Design a binder for these strands. Structure first.
Length: 97
DNA sequence: ACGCGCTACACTAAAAGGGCCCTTAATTCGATCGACTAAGAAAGGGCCCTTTATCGATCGACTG
């Protein structure tokens, strides 16, 4: 990732590995809450070309799961990791979300 | 092997998504204007009490 392992505690290293875990296991839902500036969104935005960081919380079942008009599957179809930032900000215009 | 079948453009209709925007029916309040709720009000009014008259009763000089 670019972190210095010798400058971190062992448990912090294992937490960072848990952060890797969503990339390596199929259909792995995981939630992480923490203080600002702890380097959360960096791994899901820079250090992987096959993961997406959904910003702003602007998520609808149309573009996230299945858009019935265009008949194309949403984000969850071609990305290995979908990371919802700003969990407070995520809200669904449709109820079914 | 040059006429022939495919591959490109506007109107009409249907679906769905997504702003979305108005609604509303929930909220706050926030005066507020009654609404009492005492606190002291003052007029008024009501109450009391010592005033004169008299009716004895008597106790007086005075008096014959």
């Amino acid at each position: 990732i670019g972190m210095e392992p010798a400058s971190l505690k062992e448990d912090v290293q294992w937490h960072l590995l848990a952060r890797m875990v969503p990339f390596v296991e199929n259909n792995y839902n995981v939630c992480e809450l923490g203080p600002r500036g702890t380097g959360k969104s960096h791994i899901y935005k820079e250090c992987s070309p096959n993961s997406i960081l959904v910003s702003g919380g602007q998520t609808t079942v149309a573009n996230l799961f299945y858009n019935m008009s265009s008949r194309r599957i949403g984000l969850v179809g071609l990305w290995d990791v979908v990371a919802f930032d700003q969990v407070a900000g995520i809200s669904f215009k449709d109820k079914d979300g």
